[PDB]
Symmetry: D2
Subunit: 384 residues, 4 copies
């Protein structure tokens, strides 16, 4: 509809079953598949979809990978509903889930006139993940009840990586913070800058803020030798100048913000520009934004410096929107450059970072990208 | 950056001048053109751009229309800065502005060592629009001062068309309002429905709300014969059934909301589906939205019913984003289908409706479109 | 500090202990008592206070009621930390809690070198409330862990009483809704009115909205005989006129809103005006509001009609503020008239309704009050 | 009703007239007086009230000051509507307005069958304020039209005093900022602190933030000798310690925030504690707040340190609420202590500061007060 820029989770219930699987669907509730949505805690509002045409097996009863993967890349975790005991299919999915770094759990349909219980098997057969959950169409107690629990435990969780690891408190440790011209609005500072300061202090250090011109001064006078400097833009150069200490580990704001929404992959994938060939396609996922009629970074600068920095014949595809894009649109793209400011919730960035990995498409973002296209090297500061 | 979905106005300062025109730029302030932005009242924050490469004249000193139009279609109004007296160029632009239903005003550069004043000319020569404004680089009083005034008066204004014209108050006049299943959220009603009711009452009438099933009942019993019924979706059919009076002028909610953001053009342009040819391209401007993984109206239903209703070989181009799209992307498109819910400010819809007209591309929207693809006829109710 | 008008819960940990009770305090964490606050789920942010001077026992080891009650009236539930086995004190509190309709739970300090477990006792001795919770300063697993759980279960919960019980859906059932002049703002309706409509519809009925003047008309014509009418203000009179059916159960909006934040007590307490004596004091708790410099209902009208309706010599005490007032300020007040619009969360109104009961001070509110001072009788509609 | 904590302006139309004055009322529109409200620009929504019982003159035709003042203290400016030429009454009011530092304008009722125009008189007679405005009940052009203009010009305006005057940019100038323990919330800083930093930078200086413990360090090492230090709470003491330079002008955050909502009066009035006598009454205007059940500054600490610091027998009167309090409630009060955090809009604080002056009641606030009760002396820094 529209909102203030909900990150709703996605879940896949897989299986060859249906009359002993769909009962699980519609029930256990608070161009072919069924995407029904509801809500559960302790986690939130969510969506449950079922193996669409993934129901058609092979003569050997095998999954149909390529067809699956293509479905399973969105998932935040999956659910397996089996009718019988383990078969090849049951293993095939689990191998993907596993394959695709994606959490999941298994279910059943406990009929009570025989007195069975197979899950002992899956307790260890197809992995463990202690994925073991008795159930039934006889919507019994363990239905849309105790499931949400563990499953919650299943999902991601608390990444929350320190805005810094090399803080160094105690007898202090200065942290220069050199900003631009202003930043707007009146009597305000951009979040990154504020977030920083708050950190230096949470790490009982001392934060010093200072404009460009005054770098000369400050640095020289101040007896205290810093332990961390931080900037943004080509402003990093003039600083590289009166460095004034290379012993000193410096960095961008842009980059520290980047560090909070998986950094590795971005460096890994950004370096990957050098092997770009004429005619290849790059995806500039610019999300929802107010675009300047001036040199828009995402649709102008970047594309440009990109050709320049490499060999032309490059094909760009800008994509706007709150949600990630449909695979159809990005499949067969060498690199994806995603805006940073767009997403702010680290957890919702991972969703997208993972998705990209699962499709094996290297993704990076404006920050890293531009830093790279200049010298994204000095911000070592994380090598662990 | 990001916001809660600012509608900033756009203005073009045109002229062959520059050293006697750009002084007007940067000054008079509170891949080549200069887009500088500021703010002025009584209207708001705005942008001033200058004739980029439109500076290069012909050997006869003519404008260069096609090149201009391509620029001038965004404008909310234009500003003309002339160095000399009227020439062909001065007329050429004015003919466009005029041509393109776009407001504007004229300026100068009053040097005071001669004692001139030409504007008397333009008082009537190139149109009137009483566009007459002395000025100078000697940034004198009448600079970024008394301009904003009139100019404000120049721009659009108060469309604010009655949510209804056939109200009919006095001895009352019922207005059935037949809704769907629910609408969410708890104890709430969608705005349209509320907006309606408030109107019936502002027009001292009586609003009756009632679900589907109960149409049979209500209609029959109620002595009172209505004067207006209102629905949404295929629900309009079941109503067409126990109409129960065709004398009775009925309509969609979707449609009344449409009526508030220029209706004509939409009907005019929507009817235009019949002359669509194989291979032609349609633009589904879906703005910023949360897309269902189910049949998304804009990217699925509509496209589909569209092929169906006509001859295939159709090419679609969905476009998302807060802003209208760049001409490059839509130029050479037979029709544009724009989401309704997206924009809510009638004044900001007109901006876009005009833009489309100026490019001569027929535009319509989901509402009208779907109504049409069913029977958008009965809602006569406006023929004036 | 300030906010948009957090309803934080209050809890009392009681006991004669302290070195075997306070360890429970500060620890088990995520002009004399200690009010430390933290947060716990599944419920929210909360406060834990301890028996201040309630630590001083009698020579017989009795509680000190009057002194307690005075403390215990705020509580949303209480916590009992005992050192020894049941004694008189342990019973005394429980009798209050019980006495004062307030939930609670019991704790301990399990030393493991003997091998005890007394709670079996309190399992049934001092009530049940299955209040049984092993613990220790050896902050063991069952500390600030499994407590929040049950305790949550302890607290209030889901009152959520139907905006109506006599709905009557099926073959429909009209519900007139007669409003005032307007209500503001443009194209909007006050919540109550919207909430109503949504209900009629959730109860598959038919809602008819209609202004005053048009009552004559509608009623007569309309074949359908209503089942519920609803108004506000002296407007109820003109309706009482062309009633037009007394068989017909009518009511105020003001009153239905009242029904959602305990109605009984309000009627019970409002009737209590007749036994008011000269010199008695009434509390007009007007919460945080924008006061008209015109006849403010709370500080003018009500007080006035109040004297009028009874014998003067009345003493008023208006009290503003987000929170309920300190007992010191209201103790020894015959009646409390609380604004309705102020609180909106039924659950936070109960907090206050209970508090008043616990102090045995009759409380009512503007709605009921004014309805009464006119004829709050006809809205029978709830007698169960 | 309720809102997120509108500052609506107040205006008094004065005069002995009424049939030639009230026509001005109700008309010229977009326990006895009439308070009608509307809206006008360029300023906002506002209220117009008329001389209630101030209509009854003396046998000599004099105003009735004491009775007036009592009315005129709320006003943001006044309007004078005269029937005849200047008389004593016309002078009397103007003397108050003038007396009471309050803006105003004069009007008429131009009958056109004689051909008059007296305003020439009032052009200079009763002051000037170029208060000269022809009008009439014949609601002519100059009615609710050109009035709002000038009148707007009449009212307050742009105080906006620099968060600092001794900035000292150029070759820099450090500004230590020593904070508490934290401040909450995560990765955030209280506004004052941020506002400060932004200033140092807007004044091309250098802001250094640093906790307590680290004062020792920083100060000593850092070659740079500061030019401004800033703190809050008793934390100012430990700083007074390693001052470490008294040459150095230091201060509270609390105080700089105070500086932005008239400081003088607060110092002037706060010093006035020494002449407090037993039995006198102090007003603690605490506005709308979330009160801690712990030592609430406004209702506990302050009152307490207040008695202590002086002679008991003191009477306190705490007053909560969005609006200033009615004179009846505060008249005959020696001092008023107003919360700072409450109001944030300097312009709306002045409204209240003026009001207090007009009643000649000394007002101060928590900040100043507590600073004083310790040592509010060192923050000289403003002596101009």
């Amino acid at each position: 509809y529209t909102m203030r820029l909900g990150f709703r989770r996605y879940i896949v219930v897989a299986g060859r079953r249906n009359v002993g699987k769909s009962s699980f669907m519609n029930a256990l509730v608070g161009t072919d598949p069924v995407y029904k949505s509801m809500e559960l805690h302790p986690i939130g509002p969510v969506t449950l979809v079922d193996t669409p045409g993934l129901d058609d097996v092979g003569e050997l009863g095998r999954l149909r990978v390529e067809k699956a993967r293509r479905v399973f890349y969105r998932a935040d975790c999956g659910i397996l509903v089996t009718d019988s005991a383990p078969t090849p299919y049951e293993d095939d999915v689990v191998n993907l889930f596993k394959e695709m770094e994606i959490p999941f759990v298994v279910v059943v349909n406990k009929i009570d006139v025989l007195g069975e219980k197979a899950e002992e098997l899956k307790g260890l057969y197809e992995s463990r993940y202690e994925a073991k959950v008795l159930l039934v169409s006889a919507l019994q107690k363990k239905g849309f009840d105790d499931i949400g629990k563990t499953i919650s435990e299943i999902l991601p969780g608390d990444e929350e990586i320190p805005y810094l690891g090399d803080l160094i408190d105690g007898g202090d440790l200065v942290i220069l913070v050199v900003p631009i011209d202003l930043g707007a609005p009146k009597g305000r500072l951009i979040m990154p800058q504020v977030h920083a300061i708050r950190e230096a202090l949470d790490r009982e250090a001392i934060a010093l803020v200072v404009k460009e011109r005054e770098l000369r001064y400050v640095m020289e006078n101040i007896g205290m030798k810093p332990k961390l400097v931080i900037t943004d833009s080509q402003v990093a150069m003039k600083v590289a100048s009166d460095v004034p200490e290379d012993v000193e580990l410096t960095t961008f704001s842009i980059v520290e913000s980047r560090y909070r929404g998986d950094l590795a992959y971005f460096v890994e994938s950004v370096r990957k520009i050098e092997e770009l060939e004429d005619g290849d396609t790059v995806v500039i996922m610019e999300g929802c934004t107010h675009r300047p009629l001036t040199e828009d970074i995402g649709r102008v600068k970047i594309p440009r410096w990109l050709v320049n920095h490499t060999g032309a014949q490059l094909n760009f595809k800008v994509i706007a929107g709150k949600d990630f894009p449909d695979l159809e649109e990005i499949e067969n793209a060498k690199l994806i450059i995603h805006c940073g400011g767009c997403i702010l919730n680290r957890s919702a960035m991972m969703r997208r970072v993972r998705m990209a990995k699962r499709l094996g498409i290297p993704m990076t973002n404006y920050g890293v990208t531009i830093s790279y296209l200049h010298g994204v090297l000095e911000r070592a500061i994380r090598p662990f």
